[PDB]
Paper text:
The 20S proteasome core particle (CP) is the key non-lysosomal protease of eukaryotic cells. Its seven different α and seven different β subunits assemble into four heptameric rings that are stacked on each other to form a hollow cylinder. Only three out of the seven different β subunits, namely β1, β2 and β5, bear N-terminal proteolytic active centres, and before CP maturation these are protected by propeptides. In the last stage of CP biogenesis, the prosegments are autocatalytically removed through nucleophilic attack by the active site residue Thr1 on the preceding peptide bond involving Gly(-1)45.
Bearing in mind that in contrast to Thr(-2) in β2, Leu(-2) in subunit β1 is not conserved among species, we created a β2-T(-2)V proteasome mutant. As proven by the β2-T1A crystal structures, Thr(-2) hydrogen bonds to Gly(-1)O. Although this interaction was not observed for the β5-H(-2)T-T1A mutant, exchange of Thr(-2) by Val in β2, a conservative mutation regarding size but drastic with respect to polarity, was found to inhibit maturation of this subunit. Notably, the 2FO–FC electron-density map displays a different orientation for the β2 propeptide than has been observed for the β2-T1A proteasome. In particular, Val(-2) is displaced from the S1 site and Gly(-1) is severely shifted (movement of the carbonyl oxygen atom of 3.8 Å), thereby preventing nucleophilic attack of Thr1. These results further confirm that correct positioning of the active-site residues and Gly(-1) is decisive for the maturation of the proteasome.
Residue numbers in the entry:
A (entry chain L): 1 to 111
B (entry chain D): 1 to 117, 125 to 242
C (entry chain F): 2 to 244
D (entry chain A): 1 to 250
E (entry chain G): 2 to 242
F (entry chain C): 1 to 240
G (entry chain H): -3 to 226
H (entry chain E): 3 to 233
Write the structure that this text describes.
C-alpha cells in the first residue's frame, strides 16, 4: 500500500524578544537512518519581514512555504502593496492548513 | 435584435451607457469626505404620503468602517450590498483585520461587467462607498455599472447631480469640519430636491474612525436642518 | 437576401458567403509562399515595416509545429496562431498514441477538419487565414495550402496574400523550367526573389524578409529558420534579380 | 459550437395556427398516396413504390416496415423522416415495453409512443416537426385488430379504413362506399388494390406496389419450433407474385 | 423570410437549405459513374487539375472507407472529407461492436440518417455532398448505395452523379434496356472498368487521357483505386477495338 | 439551457419587460391593505364577470404564508402561486434554522429579492405581480404592511392599494386615512377598507373579500353576510 | 456465483447442438425440478447459461433485444459473432460482477458456430464445450466419444449422454435433458424435456385431508372486481 | 452596417466591425508612451480625471517583479488581462522556477484576445496595452491590440493624440536606444515624448505616471511627488 | 448567431399580456366544446368531437375525456397531443402522492400541479406553451364533488358549471340561465346535452359526435364510480333526453 507521508526529521526553534525575533533550525535532512543532506535550508525569508519554517514531512513543508510566499505576493497585488502584518499572515496560514483538513500537510509550522 | 455585450461605433457598450440613463432618473445621493469623517446623504423621495418613509433604505452599512449610499434602480443594489458585506467579512476571516475601502470597492466593481448571454444585464444603480482605513484615512468612492470607480473629495449622483456637483466644486476645501460637511450636504440636497427638505424625506449618515458608520436619527437631522435655516438667514 | 449575414447558411447558389468574405481578409494580408524542393520544403513571408520603431527580426511570423512541420499564413494573424495552436495539440496527441511524428498528409487533414468545422455553425466565424504548411515525413517532402473553407490540396508551389498572382506566375516558371526538381539551397534563393517580386503589390512601405526550411540533407528533416549568412546571401540574390 | 437553438421553432401565430405543423401537413399532402383497411380477421396497409429512377432498385427502399411481429407501418410525406421514426419506434417498443413486461406492446400504446416523439419535435428547442403522416396497423390479444393514423402534430386517430397523401380525399370517398363490418381479409386486399389504382399514373403491378397485412400467425416465419405458445408473426409483407395473382381477379 | 436560412418548413412544405445544398453538390463541375459486374463494382470519376502548381496525386474525390467499402463524393472537398472521416469512424466502430465488417448498404443508411438529422435540427447545416458507396457485399454481392443532402438513399443497378448526370443516366438506362440484366455480364473487373469509361465517353462526348480520370474498384474482400498507368492500360484497350 | 436576456435596458434607461409586468398588475383585480392600531385588514376585489363559480374551491385571493403572515396580490394569478410557494418554503426554513418565525419585513425582503432576480437573470421574464404582505412579528403587537412590485423594490405602508383603479382608491385612502389616529378597532379598519373598495367595485355582493389579521397568529376571513352588513351600514350613512 | 448446472455444446456435420439439465438449486435445496436453461437470443442463435441464473437470463434478453434491433436496422439475419461480441463487451465492462457463464451456439449466413463465454468477458472457440458444476463429468464423456464429422443423430446422442453424466454424477445437476438442434438451412428445433429419466415413483400413501381438518377463525369474500355501476 | 451586430460576422470586404469598434475605445483613451534602451524599459502615462474633485485614473499595472503594463481604453478589461498575465507569470515561476519571457507573455495575450473575436455571445476586449519587461534577453516593449495583434517595438504610444509622441520617438530612435545605464535620461526622453501629445493641459504632479524596469531594477511605479523631479 | 431566429415565447406585450398565451387561447376557441356541470350527487362531463367521419372507429376512439385516476377525470379542449403529455404527468403525480401518503390525491392538489407546469412554460425555457385547456371533474373526502378549469397561462379556477373550447360565451350564458344549486346528476346530464345541442356548429347533435362521462356516488355505498359512456349509451341518453 502507498504511504503518501514521510519523516524528514529536523528540529526548529522560535523565540520572541522585546524588539526582535529569531527562528532557528538545523540543516540536516534525513530518511530513516540515512542522511540526505547536511545542508538543506529549512527556515525561509517570506518577505514583509516574516520568517517561516514548516517542519516534518519536507514535501508538505516545501509546498506550504511556497503557497504562503505566493499568498504574500497576491496580497500585495490585491491590496495596494500593503504590508502583510504577522497576525494577518498567521490567520492566512490557518486557512491554508485547514483547507487540507482531511488530507493534512504533515508539518509543524512556526513563523 | 443585437448582443447585450455589443460595442457602439464610438467604442462604448450600449447597455452600460443605457444603465447610466436609469441612474440619472434616480433620487439624489451626496457624499463629502473630510479629515474628521465622510458624510453620506440621500433624498428619500416617497411616491405617496401613505408610504412610511423610514422603510426607505438608501443608505446601508457594509461593515463598521464602511458605509454606502445608492441612486437609480435600488432593487439592483441588494445583491451588490450582499456581495460587499460578504467580501468585507470574508477578508476579516482570512486576514484578522479590516479590509481597505478601495479593495472593497474594487470587489464590488468586479461584478459590474459580468453580464451577457452570469446576469442578463448590467446593474441600473450607482453607489457612493464611504469609509476609513489606517493606510489611506477617510475615503469616498463612486462605483458605476461600467466597472469603473473614482475616488472623490465630494460627489453627487442621481437626478440633481450636475447642479449639485457644481455646488460641491465651490464649497469643498481641505479643512472642512464634520459639522460643516453635514450642513453642506443638507444645503445642496435642499437645493436639488423637488419637495421641501425635512427629516422625513432626507437622511444623513457618517463614518468616523472612533464610532464607525452611523445612520442619523430623524431627531438629530431635524436639529441640523434648523441650524442650516438659521445660518442662511444670518446673511 | 440575408444569406450572407450568417455563417453555414447556403445561398440559393449553394454558396457560403461568410466563407467567401473570410477570403477577402486573406487577400488583404501580406504575401506568403511555399516551395517544394528535392528533399524538403521552403517557406517565406513578406513582413511590412509599418514604422522604424519595429525591432528588426523580432516579430517572427513563421511557426513550427512539432519539430518537422513549418506553418506560414496570410490574413488575420491571430486566427493563424489559433490554428497553429490546434495543430500543435493534434500533433501531440498523434505522437502520444502512435509514437511516430504526425505525417504531413495526416496533419493536413487535422487542420482541414478543424477549419471545415468552423463552416458548419452560425455560432462561430470562419478562419480569416489561408495557411501554407508542410515538412518531411517517412514518405518524403510535402507542401500544402489550406483555405478558409477547409479546402486543401498538395502543392509543388503555393502562394497567398495580396501579391499572390505575381508569386504564382513566378512559381509556375520554376515548375516548368525544373521538371527534375529544385535543391533546398536553390529554393531558399528563389523564395527570396519571389517575395521581393511580390512586394510590388505592397510597394508603399518597405519590408523585412523571413525564410524557413525543412530538408532531409540540409536540416536533417527538422524545421529551421534561415539566419545570418545564408539569409543575407538570399537577400543579395533577390536584390540582384529586381535590378 | 453547442446547440444554441434552445427555443421553440414552432410557435402560435395571432390566429392560433401552429405554422410549422400546418406546413408539415402540406408536405404530407404532396406525398405519394398510402392507405389502410381493417377487416374482421386482419388489416391491410398499402402504398405505391414511386421509384425515383429506373436504375434504382426499389426493393431496397421499404415504405412498409415491420415495427413488431404483430405491428406494421406505412407513410406519406418525407421518406427520410419516416425512416428515422421507424428506427425510434422499433427501439421504443423494446426500451419502454418489452424489456419491462417481456412482451411486445399493444398497437395503441406503440402508436402513443410514436405520437409522443412527433409531439416533442413540435415543442422542443431547435427542431422542426416531422414531415410525415403514419398509418400503423397491428394486432394484440386483448384489443384485436386495429389501424391508426398519426399526424405531424402528434395527434392520432383509430380508423376502420383511411388514406393519406396525394389522392386521399378521393380515396377516402372510395373506401366509404366499399367498407362494411363483414369484410374478410381477402376482400379488404381486393378493395385496397382497387382504391390504390385510382391514384397511380404509370405501371400498376407487384413491382410498383408495396402491400403488407396483419393477419393470422405465421409459424413458417418464426424461425424455430418447440414452444407451443410461440406461433409466429402476424405481420406479413406480400410478395410481387402474390400481388399480381390478385390483380388478375381484379 | 428566415425559413430560407435554416432547415424549417416553407409555406409549401419545402426545405430550401436542403435544396441549396443539392446545388452546392455540382460546384466542383465533376461527373461520376458507378456500375456492377459479376464479381465486382466499379466507380469512375472525372479528374480536373486546373492549376499547374498543384500536386496532382493529392487531388482526389474517391475514398477508401474500409477494406471492403469505397466512396466517391460529388461536392466540395471540405464537406467530402468531413463525410469521409465520419464514414471511416462509423465502419471501424461497427466492426468493433458487432464483430463483422459493416455492409455497404448499412453504412449508407447510417450516413443517410446523420444527413436526415441536419435537415431537422436547426444548428447543423446539411453537407453539400452526394455520397456513392460501393462494395462487393458478402451477402448481397456487388452493391451501389447513394446518399444525398435530404437524407435519402437507395440501392442502384448503376448510377451517375454530377452536372451531366442525366446524359450518363439515360445512356446507362438504354444499355440495360437491351441486355435485360441488372449488371455488366463480364468476368474480369478490367473489362467492367473499360465498359464504364467507354459509356462515359459516349454520354459526355469527350475523350480522356490517363490524368483526366479517377477509378475505384471493389472486389471480394477489398476496394482499391487504380494508378494513372493502370488507367492508361485501360484506355489503350478501349482504343484498340 | 435557454439563456436569452429578455429584461434589458433601452436607450432612455428603461427596462420595458419590467414596466410591461406592471401593466399586467394594472389589469389585475384591485387589492387593498389598511393597518389599524392593533390589526391589519386586506381587502380584495372579485370581478363578477365569472358567475357559476364554485367559491368553496376557487383559489382565494389572500394566502397564508405562515400562521402570522398573509399575502395578497394583483396581476397574473399563475405567477403569484410561484411566489407564494417560495415564500411558504422560506418561512419554514427560517423557523428550522433560526428557531423563530419570519418577521413581516424579512418575508417581504425575500419575496422582493426573488422578483428582482427575475429582472436580471437570463432566459426568464419578470413576475407580472405586485404583492401586499401583512402580519405581526413574533411576540410583537405593532401592525405591519408592506408592498412589493415586479422590479423588486419594496416599502412599508400605513395603507396601500394595487391593481385596476388603484389610483382612485389610493385617492380615497390619502384623504380618509389619518396617521396620528389610525382605525382604533377591527370594526373601524374593516369599515374603512370596505369603503375604499366601494369607490371602485360595483355591487357590494360577492365582489368584496375581507381578511382580518390580529396579533399572535389570529387570522380570520369574513363571510358574505358579515361584509354585507358593512356594505349596508355604509350606504345608509351616505343617504344624507 | 451459483454452483450448479450441466450444459454442453457439440458441433456436427451441418450445424451445432446444445443441451442442458433442468435442475436449479438454492444451496443444497432444489428450487425448480424442471428449469429451462436453454435460452433464445434469436430464432437460430441459442445459448445455455450457468452461474447466477438471473444474470444469464438478463444478459441473454438484453443482447437478444439489441440483436433484434440490429437485425431490423441492417435487414440481415443476426450472426453468432455479433451476439458473442456484444455479450463479452458487456460482461467485461462489469468485471465479473454479472455472473453469467454461457455456451453460445447458432447458425447464420456465415455458417454454424459454437463459443463459450466467461463472466469476466473472455471467450473461446471449440467443437465441443461444457460449462457448470457438472462440466467435468460432461467433458469426460465428450473427450471419450467425440470425433470429427459427427452426424446430427450422433451429436444429439453425445450431447445428451454428456448431460446424463452430469445428472447422475454431479449433485448440482439433475432431472431432465433439454436439447436444441441448429442445422444450416433449417429451422432450429427446440426439444424441451428430450429425456425424462427421473420421474418420481408413486407415493405409498395419499395425504389428501378430510374437509374441515383445518381450524378457521374468519371467512370473507375478497373484492377483486372494480367499483361497480349504479 | 448590417455586419456589426456581433463579433462572429465578417463584412463583405472581410472586416470585423465589432473588433474595429473595440479599437475605437482605445483612441478615446488617455495617451500613454512606451520606450526602451538596452538596459532599461520605461512607461509614461497621462492619467485622466473625471473632474477637479476626482482622483486621476491609474494607468500602470505591475504584473511581476520583471514585467508590467500601461493601459488605454476600458480599464476593467485591462484588469482582466493584467490578472491573466499575473497568473501566467506566476505559473511559470511556481512550476518551472522560470521568469516568463516578455515575448511569450505577448503570445498568451494574443491568444486570449483572439477567442473573444471568433465566438458567439462574447465581445472583444476594449483596451490597448503597452507591456514592458526585463528578462533573459534584455529589455523589451510590446504593444497589444484587442484584435489580438501584439508587436515588439523600441518605442510607441497609444491613446488620443498618440501620433505626436510616436513621430517624436521615430525621430529620436537612434538617441534613446543608446541611453544605457542612465534611468533618469531614459525617463526624460519618455516625458518629452508624451509632451508631443498634450494640448491645453500640461504635466502636473498628480497628472503624470511613470514606470521603469531594468537590469538591476524591479518593476516600480512612480506617482505623486516622485515624478516632480521630471516635470 | 441563433438569437436571430428566436421568437421569444415568454415576453410581455406593452399592455402586459403574454403573446403566446393569448394566441394559444385563440387556438383553443376553435376546438370542440367541452362542458362540465357539478351536481349534489355527482358531476357530468360532456364534449363534442370535431367534424368526424363515418369511417372513424368511435368505440376505440378517445380525444376529449381522459381518466387521471379512479376519482378524477378531465375534458380536453385544444391540441390532443399536447394534452396527452400533461395527462401522463398528472397520472404520475397522483400515483406519487398515493405512494407517499397512502391516500388518494385531493383534486385541487393535482390541478395546482398541472397548472404550475403550464405556468413554467410561460416564464422560462423559451418554449411554446401547451395549447390546452382542461376541465377537471373529481371527488375527494374534503370538498366532495369539484369542477376546475386550467388554461395555457397556468391559471385555474373552480366552477359549478363551466365550458371550454368553441362558443364558450354562448354556452356559459345558457348554463348560467338554467343551472340551480339543488340540481341532480340526471338533470345536469340533460342541461349539458341541451347546451351542446344549441351551441354546436354542426347541423344536428348525434351520438357519433359526442363523448360523455359521469362521476357518481351512484356506486354501491360510500364510494365513487367513473362512467365513460359507450357509443350505444350516448345514443340512448340522447333519446331519453329527447334530442334525437
Ligand atoms: Mg439545419
Amino acid at each position: 500500500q502507498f504511504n503518501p507521508y514521510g519523516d524528514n526529521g529536523g528540529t526548529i526553534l522560535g523565540i520572541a524578544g522585546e524588539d526582535f525575533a529569531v527562528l532557528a533550525g538545523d540543516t540536516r535532512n534525513i530518511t530513516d537512518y540515512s542522511i540526505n543532506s547536511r545542508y538543506e535550508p529549512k527556515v525561509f525569508d517570506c518577505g514583509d519581514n516574516i520568517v517561516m519554517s514548516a517542519n516534518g514531512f519536507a514535501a508538505d513543508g516545501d509546498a506550504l512555504v511556497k503557497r504562503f510566499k505566493n499568498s504574500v505576493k497576491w496580497y500585495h497585488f490585491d491590496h495596494n502593496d500593503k504590508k502583510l502584518s504577522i497576525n494577518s499572515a498567521a490567520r492566512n496560514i490557518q486557512h491554508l492548513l485547514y483547507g487540507k483538513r482531511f488530507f493534512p500537510y504533515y508539518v509543524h509550522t512556526i513563523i | 435584435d443585437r448582443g447585450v455585450s455589443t460595442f457602439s461605433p464610438e467604442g462604448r457598450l450600449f447597455q452600460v451607457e443605457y444603465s447610466l440613463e436609469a441612474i440619472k432618473l434616480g433620487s439624489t445621493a451626496i457624499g463629502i469626505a473630510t479629515k474628521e469623517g465622510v458624510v453620506l446623504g440621500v433624498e428619500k423621495r416617497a411616491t405617496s404620503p401613505l408610504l412610511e418613509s423610514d422603510s426607505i433604505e438608501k443608505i446601508v452599512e457594509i461593515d463598521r468602517h464602511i458605509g454606502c449610499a445608492m441612486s437609480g434602480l435600488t432593487a439592483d443594489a441588494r445583491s451588490m450590498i450582499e456581495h460587499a458585506r460578504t467580501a468585507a467579512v470574508t477578508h476579516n476571516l482570512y486576514y484578522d483585520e479590516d479590509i481597505n475601502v478601495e479593495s472593497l470597492t474594487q470587489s464590488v466593481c468586479d461584478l459590474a461587467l459580468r453580464f451577457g448571454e452570469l446576469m442578463s444585464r448590467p446593474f441600473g444603480v450607482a453607489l457612493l462607498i464611504a469609509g476609513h482605513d489606517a493606510d489611506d484615512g477617510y475615503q469616498l468612492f463612486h462605483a458605476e455599472p461600467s466597472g469603473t470607480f473614482y475616488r472623490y473629495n465630494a460627489k453627487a449622483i442621481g437626478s440633481g447631480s450636475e447642479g449639485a456637483q457644481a455646488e460641491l466644486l465651490n464649497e469643498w476645501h481641505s479643512s472642512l469640519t464634520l459639522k460643516e460637511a453635514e450642513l453642506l450636504v443638507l444645503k445642496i440636497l435642499k437645493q436639488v430636491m423637488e419637495e421641501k427638505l425635512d427629516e422625513n424625506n432626507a437622511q444623513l449618515s457618517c463614518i468616523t474612525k472612533q464610532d464607525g458608520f452611523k445612520i442619523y436619527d430623524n431627531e438629530k437631522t431635524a436639529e441640523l436642518i434648523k441650524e442650516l435655516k438659521e445660518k442662511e438667514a444670518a446673511e | 437576401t440575408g444569406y450572407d449575414l450568417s455563417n453555414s447558411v447556403f445561398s440559393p447558389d449553394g454558396r457560403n458567403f461568410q466563407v467567401e468574405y473570410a477570403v477577402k481578409a486573406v487577400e488583404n494580408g501580406t504575401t506568403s509562399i511555399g516551395i517544394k524542393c528535392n528533399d524538403g520544403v521552403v517557406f517565406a513571408v513578406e513582413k511590412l515595416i509599418t514604422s522604424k520603431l519595429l525591432v528588426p527580426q523580432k516579430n517572427v511570423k513563421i511557426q513550427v509545429v512539432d519539430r518537422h512541420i513549418g506553418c506560414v499564413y496570410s490574413g488575420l494573424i491571430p486566427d493563424g496562431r489559433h490554428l497553429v495552436n490546434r495543430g500543435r495539440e493534434e500533433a501531440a496527441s498523434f505522437k502520444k498514441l502512435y509514437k511516430t511524428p504526425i505525417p504531413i498528409p495526416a496533419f493536413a487533414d487535422r487542420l482541414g477538419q478543424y477549419v471545415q468545422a468552423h463552416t458548419l455553425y452560425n455560432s462561430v466565424r470562419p478562419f480569416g487565414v489561408s495557411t501554407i504548411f508542410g515538412g518531411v515525413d517517412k514518405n518524403g517532402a510535402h507542401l500544402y495550402m489550406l483555405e478558409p473553407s477547409g479546402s486543401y490540396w498538395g502543392y509543388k508551389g503555393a502562394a497567398t496574400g495580396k501579391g499572390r498572382q505575381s508569386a504564382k506566375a513566378e512559381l509556375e516558371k520554376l515548375v516548368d523550367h525544373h521538371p527534375e526538381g529544385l535543391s533546398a539551397r536553390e529554393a531558399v534563393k528563389q523564395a527570396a526573389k519571389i517575395i521581393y517580386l511580390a512586394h510590388e503589390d505592397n510597394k508603399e512601405k518597405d519590408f523585412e524578409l523571413e525564410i524557413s526550411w525543412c530538408s532531409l540533407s540540409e536540416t536533417n528533416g527538422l524545421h529551421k529558420f534561415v539566419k545570418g549568412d545564408l539569409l543575407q546571401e538570399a537577400i543579395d540574390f533577390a536584390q540582384k534579380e529586381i535590378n | 459550437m453547442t446547440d444554441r437553438y434552445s427555443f421553440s421553432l414552432t410557435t402560435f401565430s395571432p390566429s392560433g395556427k401552429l405554422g410549422q405543423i400546418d406546413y408539415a401537413l402540406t408536405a404530407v399532402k404532396q406525398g405519394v398516396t398510402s392507405l389502410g383497411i381493417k377487416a374482421t380477421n386482419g388489416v391491410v396497409i398499402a402504398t405505391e413504390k414511386k421509384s425515383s429512377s429506373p436504375l434504382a432498385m426499389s426493393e431496397t427502399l421499404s415504405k412498409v416496415s415491420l415495427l413488431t411481429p404483430d405491428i406494421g407501418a406505412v407513410y406519406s410525406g418525407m421518406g427520410p423522416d419516416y425512416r428515422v421514426l421507424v428506427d425510434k419506434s422499433r427501439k421504443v417498443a423494446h426500451t419502454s415495453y418489452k424489456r419491462i413486461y417481456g412482451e411486445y406492446p399493444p398497437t395503441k400504446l406503440l402508436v402513443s409512443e410514436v405520437a409522443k416523439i412527433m409531439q416533442e419535435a413540435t415543442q422542443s428547442g431547435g427542431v422542426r416537426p416531422f414531415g410525415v403522416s403514419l398509418l400503423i396497423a397491428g394486432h394484440d390479444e386483448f384489443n384485436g385488430f386495429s389501424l391508426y393514423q398519426v399526424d405531424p402534430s402528434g395527434s392520432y386517430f383509430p380508423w376502420k379504413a383511411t388514406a393519406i397523401g396525394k389522392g386521399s380525399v378521393a380515396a377516402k370517398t372510395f373506401l366509404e362506399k366499399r367498407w362494411n363490418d363483414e369484410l374478410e381479409l381477402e376482400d379488404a386486399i381486393h378493395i385496397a388494390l382497387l382504391t390504390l389504382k385510382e391514384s397511380v399514373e404509370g405501371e400498376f403491378n407487384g413491382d410498383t406496389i408495396e402491400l403488407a397485412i396483419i393477419g393470422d400467425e405465421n409459424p413458417d416465419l418464426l424461425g424455430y419450433t418447440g414452444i407451443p405458445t410461440d406461433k409466429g408473426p402476424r405481420f406479413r409483407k406480400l410478395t410481387s407474385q402474390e400481388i399480381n395473382d390478385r390483380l388478375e381477379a381484379l | 423570410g428566415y425559413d430560407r436560412h435554416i432547415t424549417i418548413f416553407s409555406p409549401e412544405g419545402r426545405l430550401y437549405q436542403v435544396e441549396y445544398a443539392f446545388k452546392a453538390t455540382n460546384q466542383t463541375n465533376i461527373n461520376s459513374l458507378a456500375v456492377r459486374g459479376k464479381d465486382c463494382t466499379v466507380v469512375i470519376s472525372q479528374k480536373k487539375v486546373p492549376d499547374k502548381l498543384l500536386d496532382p496525386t493529392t487531388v482526389s474525390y474517391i475514398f477508401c472507407i474500409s477494406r471492403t467499402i469505397g466512396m466517391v463524393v460529388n461536392g466540395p472537398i471540405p464537406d467530402a472529407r468531413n463525410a469521409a472521416l465520419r464514414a471511416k469512424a462509423e465502419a471501424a466502430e461497427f466492426r468493433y461492436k458487432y464483430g463483422y465488417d459493416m455492409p455497404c448498404d448499412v453504412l449508407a443508411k447510417r450516413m443517410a440518417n446523420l444527413s436526415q438529422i441536419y435537415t431537422q435540427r436547426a444548428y447543423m447545416r446539411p453537407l453539400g455532398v452526394i455520397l456513392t458507396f460501393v462494395s462487393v457485399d458478402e451477402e448481397l454481392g456487388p452493391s451501389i448505395y447513394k446518399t444525398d443532402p435530404a437524407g435519402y438513399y437507395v440501392g442502384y443497378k448503376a448510377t451517375a452523379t454530377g452536372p451531366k448526370q442525366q446524359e450518363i443516366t439515360t445512356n446507362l438506362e438504354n444499355h440495360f434496356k437491351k441486355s435485360k440484366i441488372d449488371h455488366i455480364n463480364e468476368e474480369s473487373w478490367e473489362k467492367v472498368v473499360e465498359f464504364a469509361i467507354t459509356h462515359m465517353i459516349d454520354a459526355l462526348g469527350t475523350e480522356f487521357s490517363k490524368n483526366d480520370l479517377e477509378v475505384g474498384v471493389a472486389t471480394k474482400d477489398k476496394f482499391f483505386t487504380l494508378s494513372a498507368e493502370n488507367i492508361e492500360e485501360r484506355l489503350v484497350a478501349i482504343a484498340e477495338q | 439551457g435557454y439563456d436569452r436576456a429578455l429584461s434589458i435596458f433601452s436607450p432612455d434607461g428603461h427596462i420595458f419587460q419590467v414596466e410591461y409586468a406592471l401593466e399586467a398588475v394594472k389589469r389585475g383585480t384591485c387589492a387593498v391593505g389598511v393597518k389599524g392600531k392593533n390589526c391589519v385588514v386586506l381587502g380584495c376585489e372579485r370581478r363578477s364577470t365569472l358567475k357559476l363559480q364554485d367559491t368553496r374551491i376557487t383559489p382565494s385571493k389572500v394566502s397564508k404564508i405562515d400562521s402570522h403572515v398573509v399575502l395578497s396580490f394583483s396581476g397574473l394569478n399563475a405567477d403569484s402561486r410561484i411566489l407564494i410557494e417560495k415564500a411558504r418554503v422560506e418561512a419554514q426554513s427560517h423557523r428550522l434554522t433560526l428557531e423563530d418565525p419570519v418577521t413581516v419585513e424579512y418575508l417581504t425582503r425575500y419575496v422582493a429579492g426573488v422578483q428582482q432576480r427575475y429582472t436580471q437573470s437570463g432566459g426568464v421574464r419578470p413576475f407580472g405581480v405586485s404583492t401586499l404582505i401583512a402580519g405581526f412579528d413574533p411576540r410583537d403587537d405593532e401592525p405591519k404592511l408592506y408592498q412589493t412590485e415586479p422590479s423588486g423594490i419594496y416599502s412599508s405602508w400605513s395603507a396601500q392599494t394595487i391593481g385596476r383603479n388603484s389610483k382612485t382608491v389610493r385617492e380615497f385612502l390619502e384623504k380618509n386615512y389619518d396617521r396620528k389616529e389610525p382605525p382604533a378597532t377591527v370594526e373601524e379598519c374593516v369599515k374603512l377598507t370596505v369603503r375604499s373598495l366601494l369607490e371602485v367595485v360595483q355591487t357590494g355582493a360577492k365582489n368584496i373579500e375581507i381578511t382580518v389579521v390580529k396579533p399572535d397568529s389570529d387570522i380570520v376571513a369574513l363571510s358574505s353576510e358579515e361584509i354585507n352588513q358593512y356594505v349596508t351600514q355604509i350606504e345608509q350613512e351616505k343617504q344624507e | 456465483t451459483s454452483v450448479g448446472t450441466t450444459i454442453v455444446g457439440v458441433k456436427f456435420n451441418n450445424g451445432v447442438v446444445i443441451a442442458a439439465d433442468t435442475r436449479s438449486t438454492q444451496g443444497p435445496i432444489v428450487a425448480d425440478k424442471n428449469c429451462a436453461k436453454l435460452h433464445r437470443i434469436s430464432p437460430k442463435i441459442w445459448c445455455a447459461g450457468a452461474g447466477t441464473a438471473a444474470d444469464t437470463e438478463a444478459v441473454t434478453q438484453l443482447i437478444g433485444s439489441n440483436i433484434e434491433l440490429h437485425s431490423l436496422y441492417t435487414s440481415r439475419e443476426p450472426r453468432v459473432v455479433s451476439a458473442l461480441q456484444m455479450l463479452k463487451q458487456h460482461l467485461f465492462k462489469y468485471q465479473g460482477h454479472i455472473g453469467a457463464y454461457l455456451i453460445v451456439a447458432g447458425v447464420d449466413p456465415t455458417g454454424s458456430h459454437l463459443f463459450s463465454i466467461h463472466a469476466h468477458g473472455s471467450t473461446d472457440v471449440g467443437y465441443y464445450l461444457s460449462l457448470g458444476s457438472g462440466s467435468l463429468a460432461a467433458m469426460a464423456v465428450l473427450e471419450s466419444h467425440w470425433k470429427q464429422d459427427l452426424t446430427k443423430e450422433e451429436a444429439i446422442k453425445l450431447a445428451s449422454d454428456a448431460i446424463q453424466a452430469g445428472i447422475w454424477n454431479d449433485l448440482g445437476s439433475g432431472s431432465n435433458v433439454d436439447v436444441c438442434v441448429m442445422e444450416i438451412g433449417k429451422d432450429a428445433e427446440y426439444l424441451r424435456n428430450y429425456l425424462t429419466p427421473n420421474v418420481r415413483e408413486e407415493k405409498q400413501k395419499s395425504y389428501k385431508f378430510p374437509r374441515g381438518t383445518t381450524a378457521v377463525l374468519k371467512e370473507s369474500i375478497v373484492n377483486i372486481c372494480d367499483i361497480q355501476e349504479e | 452596417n448590417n455586419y456589426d451586430g456581433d463579433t462572429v460576422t465578417f463584412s463583405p470586404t472581410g472586416r470585423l466591425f465589432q473588433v474595429e469598434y473595440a479599437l475605437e475605445a482605445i483612441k478615446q483613451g488617455s495617451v500613454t508612451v512606451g520606450l526602451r534602451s538596452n538596459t532599461h524599459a520605461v512607461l509614461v502615462a497621462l492619467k485622466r480625471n473625471a473632474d477637479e474633485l476626482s482622483s486621476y485614473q491609474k494607468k500602470i499595472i505591475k504584473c511581476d517583479e520583471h514585467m508590467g503594463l500601461s493601459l488605454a481604453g476600458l480599464a476593467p478589461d485591462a484588469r482582466v488581462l493584467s490578472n491573466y498575465l499575473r497568473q501566467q507569470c506566476n505559473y511559470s515561476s511556481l512550476v518551472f522556477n522560470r521568469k516568463l519571457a516578455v515575448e511569450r507573455a505577448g503570445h498568451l495575450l494574443c491568444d486570449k484576445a483572439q477567442k473573444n473575436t471568433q465566438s458567439y455571445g462574447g465581445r472583444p476586449y476594449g483596451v490597448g496595452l503597452l507591456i514592458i519587461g526585463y528578462d533573459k534577453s534584455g529589455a523589451h516593449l510590446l504593444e497589444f491590440q484587442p484584435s489580438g495583434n501584439v508587436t515588439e517595438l523600441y518605442g510607441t504610444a497609444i491613446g488620443a493624440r498618440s501620433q505626436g509622441a510616436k513621430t517624436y520617438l521615430e525621430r529620436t530612435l537612434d538617441t534613446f536606444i543608446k541611453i544605457d545605464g542612465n534611468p533618469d535620461e531614459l525617463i526624460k526622453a519618455g516625458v518629452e515624448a508624451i509632451s508631443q501629445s498634450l494640448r491645453d493641459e500640461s504635466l502636473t504632479v498628480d497628472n503624470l505616471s511613470i514606470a521603469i524596469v531594468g537590469k538591476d531594477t524591479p518593476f516600480t511605479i512612480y506617482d505623486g511627488e516622485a515624478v516632480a523631479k521630471y516635470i | 448567431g441563433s438569437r436571430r431566429y428566436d421568437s421569444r415565447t415568454t415576453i410581455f406585450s406593452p399592455e402586459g399580456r403574454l403573446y403566446q398565451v393569448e394566441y394559444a387561447l385563440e387556438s383553443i376557441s376553435h376546438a370542440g366544446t367541452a362542458i362540465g356541470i357539478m351536481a349534489s350527487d355527482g358531476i357530468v362531463l360532456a364534449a363534442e368531437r370535431k367534424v368526424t367521419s363515418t369511417l372513424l372507429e368511435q368505440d376505440t376512439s378517445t380525444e376529449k375525456l381522459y381518466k387521471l385516476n379512479d376519482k378524477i377525470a378531465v375534458a380536453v379542449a385544444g391540441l390532443t397531443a399536447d394534452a396527452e403529455i400533461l395527462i401522463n404527468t398528472a397520472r404520475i403525480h397522483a400515483q406519487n402522492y398515493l405512494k407517499t401518503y397512502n391516500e388518494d390525491i385531493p383534486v385541487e392538489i393535482l390541478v395546482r400541479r398541472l397548472s404550475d407546469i403550464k405556468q413554467g412554460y410561460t416564464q422560462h425555457g423559451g418554449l411554446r406553451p401547451f395549447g390546452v385547456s382542461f376541465i377537471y371533474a373529481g371527488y375527494d373526502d374534503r370538498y366532495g364533488y369539484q369542477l376546475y378549469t386550467s388554461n395555457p397561462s397556468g391559471n385555474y379556477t373552480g366552477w359549478k358549471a363551466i365550458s371550454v373550447g368553441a362558443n364558450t360565451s354562448a354556452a356559459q350564458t345558457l348554463l348560467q340561465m338554467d343551472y340551480k344549486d339543488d340540481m341532480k346528476v340526471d338533470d345536469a346530464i340533460e342541461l349539458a346535452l341541451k347546451t351542446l345541442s344549441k351551441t354546436t356548429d354542426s347541423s344536428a347533435l348525434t351520438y357519433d359526435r359526442l363523448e360523455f362521462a359521469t362521476i357518481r356516488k351512484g356506486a354501491n355505498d360510500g364510494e365513487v364510480y367513473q362512467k365513460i359512456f359507450k357509443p350505444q349509451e350516448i345514443k340512448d341518453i340522447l333519446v331519453k333526453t329527447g334530442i334525437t
